[PDB]
Amino acid sequence: AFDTLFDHAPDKLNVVKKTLITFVNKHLNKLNLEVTELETQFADGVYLVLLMGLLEGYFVPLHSFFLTPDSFEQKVLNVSFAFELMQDGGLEKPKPRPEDIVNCDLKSTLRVLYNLFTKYRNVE
Template identity: 35%
Template structure:
């Protein structure tokens, strides 16, 4: 059978399975299209995650071969969280019945979601999806675990898949296609790490904030002398926004998403981020 025809047939079978399930009106479900399952980037990510789990849990003599097949009952996730987060979970080590497995998984995911500080609306997994061995949800879950507990790991970047979204409406099933990213690009990951640096600074080392602001202000004032402007306060001088925009347009960069309204509203983190971008781009010209 031709590959395209085989993929189409597989998706029809998957859709029919969804129709046979009890999907309530308004509910949406996602699944990876068959055409993306053999994507080399997706395969590389799955291999990376399997090797990471097996290495992490080597001393527990646990061997994972399939992400969705081996993680659905919560056993592997239980060991991972205890190993990575030193968390003590009040669950049975081995749950034999389906009811107990689902209950165990629910407790584990509730604990994990609290650790990640994610709102329920932003979660890309659920107890139901993981328990039903949904690959997409399982991948999102594992990538989030690594991002929180071991952010230094070089997860394969820019992994995305074609997904089909099925929604149950009063008139039957409605489907649409879209592209979903599972891991970020290198650039996006670097941008996120910059934001995290200032989060840590503002939260855990506020005593160093004045020194950082002084470095940035000296840098800014060196570049705007010709305009007859002197910046004395990074918090409240609103014309800093116009200055930053002019410099960014001149340099052709802003590699960290920033809302200009945050600058105007005196959001210190946003101000530091935009000044940091400018500083990294132009600091070599000061020497």
């Protein structure tokens, strides 16, 4: 269902990405962080972690994840922790593996963010 909107609807996919950048910046700008490139800016897990706290109203202690990840391993660990936080929030386990996010798989990234969007639409 998300595959069709990715592979066979560029007319949709672009209102989508416009709106997904709108959505994430709504929340991330509060930390004075801007997202301009959906393809890479969530790969290291940091913004996903920060986003989840913004959407679900908690702080994430800085000893709990790697704020400046220094290896592939730390990024995967950050992403995995982010998926755990999504599950804590009532989302079913994310389809992509954490590595798919770290490797900048755009469909995966956009699925995750879109699955956030469907949930956290009305959140301010």
